[PDB]
């Protein structure tokens, strides 16, 4: 312990710790609910607990925020950036002082979002406040007269930034000094000057050996991916659509196969070869791979896909990637269980491109040996729509689901196709997961996501990790929706567990949303409401303005909750009945109850259970 590390060129003494290992339990192996081939770990690199800050270090961290340093934020520092450099070059021209007019024209024409974005980084100093004159170079003689002689506020305070002296700014602000004691240096892009003539920021970064995000993405792209690459970057939408990878080259080879298996180039079946540009002799695992492309929006490729997938198997030609494109694009009820079930028991890669006008992920691939560290769940539509679900049991013997290749931003054009991995906040169980009145297969599938594989990015849903994903599984995100629309016997959270069997080491999960099957205008329920699991449907937390949701597969539930059986409600029976009226809109509107003709009318608000509409 108690070593030295470098953080700004400067060598510094620091307290350093190794990342806690993911503790797998032997019950996570014997239920086949842990990762099937290799235990994943999220924190690949060490932690900095404290850094001995010194005058020599914090003035180096000051000079980097002014210059940009020599890293990625070079050319966006306080006195070396695109707006500051365009203003200094005009002051360096031979013209008279009123060329300030042309600098203002360079903020009205096209650049109105680069100024009024860089301006803020000076503005807290730039508004005079009885301080600005001490940080104003030789222009301190001109300022007190010339202040009266400006035609617009911007034309004035442009003349402050273009005449500030960099040599005055060797002081760090009180908050940004404490992040430096945690070992995170001011980002030169996030640096601003506050009121007191001192450098502060809205952003701080570790040294790259201590970055948790890029070291994880590097490790995943270099060893979990088939068609691996040495970088940490996600693939572009054009790379994802064309099926191309850094350090690999693609050739179309469809002609021999089209001649063997009798298809036209228009029939929507393709074969392509990938080969690594520098081959790797040192381990025989993969240097080239045959890839099968099936555009199932075509009707020849859909008709023949199962036949072709089997003719390639009995001929013994080996496929490294199957790519199934436009699933559900033409017809949203289009089935795939017969096609996905015809694929080999042992597969290197599977890319599925689902249509978001279908959002039909109902096909299930559990009873296999292996997806060899690749399943890609992709769309060319809206990938963060609340109607995106997976069955958690459908991934049981998939080693890694692709969670990189995330390509969503506000800055894309509308009306072009962009491809990305799906964000899932829903777990959706299917009818074959509830055969004998047993709740066993669901509690396995539920804990798979919520604890047994939770340290992996895919099982975290759309919000990602906490501070320590491998240790404190409770502090991490999870899919907060449950859908039971396919599994008609479930009426409640009865028989469902939301904690790890343990308790003192982890948070218990809370769901925000619950979809239930219903078939009639009445929600029929037994007197199990005494023992529906109660506090487990409570959003993320207790104080929130927005309450959690209940939904039904029909929406016709504007007739009552029909309460059946003779047994009286308890105190938690009352509390559970409230939630179905509160959390479901089309029940909330009138609060209607039905008691079928037995018992006392222990409740005082209901109809006599007619069943007529």
């Amino acid at each position: 312990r108690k070593q030295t590390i470098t953080i700004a060129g400067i060598e510094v003494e620091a307290e350093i710790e190794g990342p806690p290992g993911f503790v797998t339990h032997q019950r996570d192996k014997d239920r086949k609910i842990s990762n099937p081939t290799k235990p994943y770990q999220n924190h690949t690199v060490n932690k900095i607990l404290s850094v001995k800050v010194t005058d020599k270090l914090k003035e180096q961290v000051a000079k980097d925020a002014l210059s940009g340093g020599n890293g990625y934020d070079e050319g966006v520092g306080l006195f070396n950036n695109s707006i500051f450099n365009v203003f200094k070059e005009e002051f360096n021209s031979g013209k008279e002082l009123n060329d300030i007019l042309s600098s203002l024209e360079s903020v009205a024409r096209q650049n109105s979002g680069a100024f009024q974005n860089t301006l803020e980084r000076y503005k807290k100093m730039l508004d005079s406040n009885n301080v600005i004159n001490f940080l104003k170079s030789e222009a301190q003689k001109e300022y007190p007269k010339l202040k009266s002689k400006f035609q617009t506020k911007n034309q004035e305070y442009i003349w402050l930034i273009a005449n500030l002296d960099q040599s005055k700014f060797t002081k760090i602000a009180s908050t940004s000094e404490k992040y430096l004691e945690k070992g995170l240096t001011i980002s030169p892009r996030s640096a601003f000057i506050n009121e007191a003539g001192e450098i502060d920021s809205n952003g701080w970064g570790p040294p790259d050996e201590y970055n948790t995000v890029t070291s994880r993405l590097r490790r995943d792209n270099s060893e979990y991916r088939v068609f691996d690459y040495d970088e940490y970057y996600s693939r572009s939408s054009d790379r994802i659509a064309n099926g191309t990878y850094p350090g690999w080259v693609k050739e179309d080879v469809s002609e021999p196969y089209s001649k063997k298996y009798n298809f036209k180039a228009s029939d929507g079946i393709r074969f392509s070869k990938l080969e690594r540009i520098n081959p790797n002799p040192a381990k025989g695992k993969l240097n080239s791979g045959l890839v099968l492309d099936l555009d199932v929006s075509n009707d020849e490729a859909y008709r023949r896909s199962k036949e072709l997938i089997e003719k390639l198997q009995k001929d013994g030609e080996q496929i490294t990637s199957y790519r199934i494109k436009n699933m559900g694009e033409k017809n949203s009820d289009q089935a795939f269980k017969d096609i996905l079930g015809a694929l080999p028991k042992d597969i290197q890669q599977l890319e599925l491109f689902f249509s978001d006008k279908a959002t039909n992920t109902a096909s299930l691939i559990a009873l296999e040996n292996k997806n060899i560290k690749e399943l890609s769940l992709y769309t060319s539509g809206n990938s963060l729509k609340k109607a995106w679900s997976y069955n958690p049991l459908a991934l049981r013997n998939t080693t890694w689901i692709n969670t990189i290749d995330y390509n969503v931003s506000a800055e894309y054009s509308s009306h072009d196709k962009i491809t990305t991995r799906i964000t899932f906040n829903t777990l959706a169980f299917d009818q074959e997961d509830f055969s004998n009145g047993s709740y066993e297969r669901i509690n396995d599938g539920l804990r798979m996501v919520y604890y047994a594989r939770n340290n992996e990015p895919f099982f975290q849903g759309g919000h990602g990790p906490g501070l320590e994903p491998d240790k404190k599984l409770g502090q991490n995100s999870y899919p907060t929706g449950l859908d039971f629309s396919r599994v008609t016997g479930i009426k409640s959270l009865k028989g469902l567990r939301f904690d790890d069997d343990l308790d003192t080491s982890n948070e218990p999960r809370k769901i925000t949303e619950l979809t239930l099957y219903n078939n009639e205008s009445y929600f029929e329920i037994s007197s199990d409401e005494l023992n529906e699991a109660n506090l487990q449907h409570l959003s993320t937390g207790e104080g929130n303005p927005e309450k959690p949701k209940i939904h039904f597969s029909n929406g016709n539930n504007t007739t009552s909750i029909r309460i059946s059986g003779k047994t009286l409600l308890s105190d938690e029976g009352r509390r559970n009945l409230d939630k179905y009226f509160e959390y479901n809109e089309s029940l909330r509107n009138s609060g209607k109850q039905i008691q079928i003709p037995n018992g006392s009318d222990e409740l005082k608000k209901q109809l006599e259970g007619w069943g007529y509409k």
Binding site: K147, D333, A362, S363, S414, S553, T558, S590
Partner: protein
């Protein structure tokens, strides 16, 4: 739920009542929401003469209610003879009974992108009601010249008091245009304790515009209202409109000479027929049913014509994207080449104008005194039949076609050979067996109406689902309204919702709003709705305002009830260089239950179960939550002299030969003169009068 009925015990007696006694309950409630406003005050009859109000014992209404339920014809009795047709404003509509859905009554207009059953699509709104259609004129101004003549009568058919007191009073948006602009300059003046106030020159924004905003007040000779468009708390506060409308019309009539902007007439059609030269083998010349205010978009200045339609390949229970966003639609756009005109290939052939006007059968000779104003004006029903000749639209020497899908151009990858390309355009209506038929039964006879006469409620668990299955249905997966009022789109479905108004449309239906994303038959799922619920159409509306036949919910006679819609009666420009002519709405008409598709979907066929064409939808009222459809056929109706010499009239505007019909004013007898001796898909024995099938005759056949 039951508050309109006085509770569950008061609803039970409404279920047991007949339609006459159901009406008397709803009409004494409709009349009190109505007489909260003081109503029609036109020419009136004295305390005698309620012998007409007793002549209603043969067919039932009430005379002083009828004078206000809407602009109805009532009575005029100074010589026991005449009609009064009203114009002194308009009257609103709702009905808190056709629904019972128990939550979202404001969604009583249909679902929008979803298919319930095969008789709705894979039969009706797919393959047959094929085209959402567009006609593009390369202009804008003919709406605005007439709307500014209307705005000029609004300006100056006005009292000298309001010539000030509607303009100089309602000037508060100019005051807001100052105090908002001032609040920018007020805040900009905060940090200028030493710095020179160059900004005082921009504070001429009050002063140099005060003289202009006061000279625009003083004259008020014809500029009789404020120059201002709209206002809100924040957005949409723009004010700039001009005044003196004949100078604004002089600007419009020169903007009309620049080919800069383009506008569309757009509506809906169904395929009804084709001319049969070649023993049915490979047809090229097709006839489409639509409505007359849509078919008048066929003008000589037209730059393009298009057909966008749901492809036959599609499956029931699916929910679509918008029409420009789903690849299950295809669009075919046609444009002229070498100075060929688009009317040389696309023609309005029948217009249903003045189709009663043989002697003694009309109604215009029955108007009391307002025939002084409504001189020369005729009668019509809003229905028209358009011919499209694809053998001279796919002729590459005269026109260029383009094929589109999901807003891609797909022309060079689509079908190319003409007989296959006409089959891919027309969803192969030639080689289909489910060709259209027309509803031959009288909807006014009691045994016909009883086939559509729904129970308000039933026991779904009991054995009498039989007799609820066996109801006749109204089907209307027809019409494509513009997507602007499509409320089923989520606030965060941005790409569908972005180009909301321009180029984009919905596949509107006649069904529960509850179906929207819920009918999807995913593998391993169970159906969430009972087979009786999705497996039907819907019915007639219990709206009081539009109804004429009181014991028949949703049946009306248009001239006694709905003779005019909006501000102005309907004009159609006649061919052969004749003048425009004005027409009142006339004929037997229907009120569909769940159908107020705003901003389009005029021309939408109402059908029944076995693909029988029943009525044509043309007007919407999204406050009534219903709208109006032209019946093709009428058995007539007799009022026992209640309305003087007036009668509903017996007619068929597809087959002709009805007792009051002009004998030259139906689809068959129009097509007989154009194509004498040839066959048709509806007329396989030819267009001659002896080849009407005996189902469509009248009086000698009383069952149809």
């Amino acid at each position: 739920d039951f508050a309109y009925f006085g509770g569950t015990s008061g609803y039970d007696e409404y279920t047991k009542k007949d339609q006459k006694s159901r009406f008397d309950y709803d009409n004494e409630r409709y009349m009190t929401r109505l007489k909260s406003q003081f109503g029609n005050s036109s020419n009136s009859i004295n305390l005698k003469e309620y012998r007409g109000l007793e002549t209603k014992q043969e067919n039932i209404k009430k005379f002083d209610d009828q004078a206000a339920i809407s602009n109805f014809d009532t009575y005029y009795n100074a010589a026991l003879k005449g009609f009064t047709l009203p114009v002194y404003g308009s009257d609103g509509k709702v009905s808190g009974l056709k629904i019972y859905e128990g939550a979202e009554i404001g969604k009583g207009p249909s679902v929008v992108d979803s298919l319930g059953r095969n008789e709705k699509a894979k039969t009706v709104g797919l393959a047959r009601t094929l085209p959402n259609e567009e006609y593009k004129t390369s202009a804008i101004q003919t709406f605005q010249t007439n709307f500014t003549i209307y705005k000029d009568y609004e300006k100056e058919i006005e009292e000298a008091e309001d010539n000030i007191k509607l303009f100089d009073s309602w000037n508060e948006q100019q005051i807001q245009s100052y105090i908002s602009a001032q609040l920018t300059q007020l805040r900009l003046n905060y940090e200028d304790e030493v710095s020179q106030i160059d900004r005082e020159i921009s504070q001429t924004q009050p002063d140099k515009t005060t003289i202009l905003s006061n000279l625009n007040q003083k004259k008020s000779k014809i500029e009789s209202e404020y120059q201002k468009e709209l206002s809100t708390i924040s957005k949409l506060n723009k004010d700039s409109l001009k005044e003196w409308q004949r100078k604004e019309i002089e600007k419009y009539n020169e903007k009309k000479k620049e080919k800069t902007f383009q506008i569309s007439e757009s509506g809906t059609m169904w395929i009804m027929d084709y001319l049969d030269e070649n023993a049915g083998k490979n047809p090229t010349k097709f006839y489409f049913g639509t409505n007359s205010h849509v078919a008048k978009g066929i003008k000589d200045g037209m730059v393009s014509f298009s057909l966008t339609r749901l492809n036959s390949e599609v499956k029931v229970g699916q929910t679509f994207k918008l029409n420009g966003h789903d690849s299950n639609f295809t669009k075919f756009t046609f444009s002229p080449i070498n100075g060929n005109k688009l009317e040389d290939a696309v023609t309005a052939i029948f217009h249903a104008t003045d189709f009663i006007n043989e002697n003694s059968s009309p109604l215009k000779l029955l108007d009391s005194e307002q025939k002084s104003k409504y001189n020369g004006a005729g009668i019509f029903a809003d229905f028209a039949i358009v011919e499209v000749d694809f053998a001279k639209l796919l002729d590459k020497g005269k026109y260029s076609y383009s094929v589109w899908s999901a807003s891609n151009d797909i022309t060079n990858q689509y079908e190319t050979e003409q007989n296959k390309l006409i089959s891919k355009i027309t969803n192969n209506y030639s080689e289909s067996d489910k060709k259209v038929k027309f509803f031959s039964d009288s909807l006014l006879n009691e045994q016909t109406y009883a086939k559509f006469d729904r129970p308000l409620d039933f026991d779904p668990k009991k054995e009498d689902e039989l007799k609820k299955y066996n109801d006749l249905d109204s089907l209307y997966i027809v019409g494509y309204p513009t997507a602007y009022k499509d409320f089923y789109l989520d606030q965060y479905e941005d790409e569908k919702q972005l180009k909301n108004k321009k180029y984009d449309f919905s596949l509107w239906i006649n069904s529960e709003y509850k179906f929207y994303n819920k009918l999807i038959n995913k593998e391993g799922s169970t159906n969430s709705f009972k087979e009786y619920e999705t497996g039907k159409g819907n019915f007639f509306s219990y709206q009081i305002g539009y109804r004429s036949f009181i014991d028949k919910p949703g049946l009306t006679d248009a001239f006694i009830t709905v003779n005019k819609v909006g501000k102005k009666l309907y004009s159609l420009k006649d061919k052969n260089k004749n003048e425009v002519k004005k027409y009142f709405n006339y004929g037997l008409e229907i009120l569909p239950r769940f159908y107020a598709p705003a901003g389009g979907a005029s021309g939408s066929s109402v059908r029944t179960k076995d693909n029988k064409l029943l009525a044509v939808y043309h007007a919407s009222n999204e406050t009534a939550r219903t709208g109006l459809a032209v019946a093709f056929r009428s058995d007539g109706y007799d009022y026992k002299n209640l309305f003087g010499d007036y009668k509903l009239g017996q007619y068929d505007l597809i087959y002709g030969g009805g007792k009051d019909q002009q004998k030259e004013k139906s689809y068959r007898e129009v097509m007989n003169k154009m194509y004498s001796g040839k066959k048709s898909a509806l007329f396989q024995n030819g267009f001659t009068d002896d080849k009407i099938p005996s189902e469509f005759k009248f009086n000698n056949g009383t069952q149809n």
